[PDB]
Ligand binder design. Sequence first.
Ligand SMILES: C[C@H](CCC(=O)NCCC[N+](C)(C)CCCS(=O)(=O)[O-])[C@H]1CC[C@H]2[C@@H]3[C@H](O)C[C@@H]4C[C@H](O)CC[C@]4(C)[C@H]3C[C@H](O)[C@]12C
Ligand SMILES: C[C@H](CCC(=O)NCCC[N+](C)(C)CCCS(=O)(=O)[O-])[C@H]1CC[C@H]2[C@@H]3[C@H](O)C[C@@H]4C[C@H](O)CC[C@]4(C)[C@H]3C[C@H](O)[C@]12C
Lengths: 181, 181
Amino acid sequence: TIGIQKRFYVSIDKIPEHVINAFVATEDRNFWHHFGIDPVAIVRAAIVNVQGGSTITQQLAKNLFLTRERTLERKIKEALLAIKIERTFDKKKIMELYLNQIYLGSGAYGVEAAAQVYFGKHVWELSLDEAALLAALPKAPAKYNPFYHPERALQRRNLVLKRMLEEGYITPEQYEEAVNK
Amino acid sequence: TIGIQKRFYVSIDKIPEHVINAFVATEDRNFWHHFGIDPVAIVRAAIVNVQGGSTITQQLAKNLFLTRERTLERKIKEALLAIKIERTFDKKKIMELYLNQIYLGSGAYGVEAAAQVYFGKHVWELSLDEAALLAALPKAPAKYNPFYHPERALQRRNLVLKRMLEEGYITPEQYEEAVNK
Ligand SMILES: C[C@H](CCC(=O)NCCC[N+](C)(C)CCCS(=O)(=O)[O-])[C@H]1CC[C@H]2[C@@H]3[C@H](O)C[C@@H]4C[C@H](O)CC[C@]4(C)[C@H]3C[C@H](O)[C@]12C
Ligand SMILES: C[C@H](CCC(=O)NCCC[N+](C)(C)CCCS(=O)(=O)[O-])[C@H]1CC[C@H]2[C@@H]3[C@H](O)C[C@@H]4C[C@H](O)CC[C@]4(C)[C@H]3C[C@H](O)[C@]12C
């Protein structure tokens, strides 16, 4: 009806853990523990002879700005906003907001809209390999879109699955089966 | 445990309509229709020989800033943030976020925490006259706190009830009974 970004909203309790886990493992491994920004993650990423140091909270803050500028000043504003958001709402709520607003390509905002556009299903009906595919998109939706870059999409999906394996969110068995899907 | 502002969070479906209606009638009558800012409300308030022109969305944006400055520049940033928020999440979601973060005095953030501190009950167990009391607080929690300014508190509570009556959220009968509570 109105608001493409407001198409479908789904509560966190109806979002599969594989989905939540895929995004966390891929975009912000220490999400459940940091306070809006991850100093250690910024250092881990720094000392790399590719890695992003921003958190899920920071990605959310980034989209709360009407304009799109990547000036260092904007980066600071986004971080301060993330910090305040973290003091106001708990992790599950922040995760909920993030998952429902994230642009996942093909005009789909939020995991529910993405599930429909890419798999013709509801997010709660997604399999592990399908969840991993959605988590691969935030990096660059157009570059990894499965509709016209299925090669890169598949490659990044399996990378997400590997991240999930390393974080302990899925077992070796689940991993072997999913990367072959 | 941690985060005074994150004590209790309650979903919009568990918040009584009298509560939602009381806040809307008192703080932002056209909430369900504007786009983050209310031009007409700003004019209605302007032409007054007392009235606030900000929306619920703007009050939410105001609290997403780590610092507290009332410069015209901040006012603009808050409005732009409200506008983007409105394009990202629907009204019920914005209302939900607002109602859970609003400082209502006595260290209570959000209507649930307020219900407990002021009435020793859950927000969903509140009566009309109790809901109106919470909606009276945002204007200035310390000045209208029922614990030490019960006179002003009661006076503003009945004003909220009158606003609800005018907006058609409650009947004359309900009004007569509530103002006498
Ligand atoms: C805004 C910055 C930090 C953010 C930042 O500058 N981040 C740069 C990283 C850039 N990235 C690697 C993410 C880019 C990757 C590109 S990507 O596309 O992946 O996003 C600085 C300025 C304001 C500082 C806070 C205040 O003092 C208050 C308080 C003092 C305490 O003592 C420590 C805690 C706290 C909250 C301080 C934290 C941090 O000190 C802040 C947020
Ligand atoms: C930020 C301001 C508006 C807010 C403002 O300046 N508000 C002052 C009122 C102060 N109050 C009475 C609330 C104080 C009360 C004290 S209280 O304590 O009660 O809060 C200006 C600057 C940027 C402008 C937008 C952009 O152009 C984009 C777009 C153009 C379209 O053409 C019309 C729609 C839109 C969204 C424009 C709307 C509005 O034009 C904006 C937000």
